[PDB]
Amino acid sequence: MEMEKEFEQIDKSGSWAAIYQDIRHEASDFPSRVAKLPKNKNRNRYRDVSPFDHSRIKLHQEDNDYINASLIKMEEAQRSYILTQGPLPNTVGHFWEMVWEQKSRGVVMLNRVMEKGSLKCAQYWPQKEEKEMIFEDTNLKLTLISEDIKSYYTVRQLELENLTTQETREILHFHYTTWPDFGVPESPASFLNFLFKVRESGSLSPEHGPVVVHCSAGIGRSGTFCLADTCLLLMDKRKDPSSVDIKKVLLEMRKFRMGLIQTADQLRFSYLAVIEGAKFIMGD
């Protein structure tokens, strides 16, 4: 059913809460036993948000391989994403280890460091060219190369060095800086502009490791970003664009990480973003 009509039918009937609870009821439940080991308590931001054992990203070290991060692998769309929490004071070194080991080109950040007067994630990248960061626990160096500040987002060029081998790589940091403290944006225009900038960079392409995407918990805004991207890509591959079912794509993604899309308002915004985004996809 053309999602634009499904959209007006749910709006006129005011049933967003009912659709959202149906998704919550049908979502997969897989074990997260590694996340809950006592040795990992200070590696989790939130007690109720954990990666499943089957899809978790493993760090390449014998000591403790755990990070709160999941591989979302979308078989038909041919896209992969790593969704992760905002880094904590004791996991900033683990975060950059994962970027290095997974061969990621891009990091997508959908939150501010401070929101609602509380810290939502560590200051995990350098703010000045001449003040680089060293992560002694994982043997990495990170340098700010350049910064481009726009009205809705900032793009940064970073240099990551493996101090063990002296190899270097360029990482692009895409920072969406205008998501409101409460609710969702009124129009999806600036979020879609941002998505198109990440795509144009090469960061989502199969010649690189998966993009790393985060917010505070790595399920709500992070969920909206990957759901919109996958739905738009499927509309371009299929003979019948109207066959793309956003609720079925979301349940497929929830096989790989719990809780993706945190509110009925986030579900409505995801529909809005895909409907507006299609106009350009359909060469219009």
Ligand X SMILES: CSc1ncccc1C(N)=O
Stretch that binds ligand X, among 128-136, 182-190, 235-243, 255-263 (CB under 6 A): 235-243
Site size toward ligand X, by CB under 6 A: 6
Contact between 236 and ligand X (CB under 6 A)? yes
Q: Does 241 bind ligand X (CB under 6 A)?
A: yes
In the bound state with ligand X, the residue whose beta carbon lies nearer, of 160 and 234, is 234
Among this protein's residues, is 226 annotated catalytic? no
Q: Which is nearer to ligand X, 155 or 192 (CB)?
A: 192
Q: Check binding of 2 to ligand X (CB under 6 A).
A: no
Asked whether residue 181 is marked as a ligand-binding residue, the answer is yes
- Contact (Cβ atoms closer than 8 angstroms) between residue 184 and residue 225: no
**Minimal CB distance residue for ligand X:** 282
Annotated ligand binding at 218? The verdict is yes
Which of 91-99, 112-120, 156-164, 276-284 is the region at the interface with ligand X (rule: CB under 6 A)?
A: 276-284
For residue 202, give both structure tokens.
């090469």
- Tokens, residue 95: 């975060």
Question: Is residue 275 within the footprint of ligand X (CB under 6 A)?
Answer: no
Min separation Cβ 253 and ligand X, Å: 21
Query: Which C-beta is closer to ligand X: that of 207 or that of 284?
Result: 284
Asked whether position 282 contacts ligand X by CB under 6 A, the answer is: yes
76 near ligand X (CB under 6 A)? no
Q: Which residues are annotated as a binding site for substrate?
A: 181, 215-221, 262
The residues assigned a catalytic role are 215
Binding site for ligand X (CB under 6 A): 236, 238, 241, 281-283
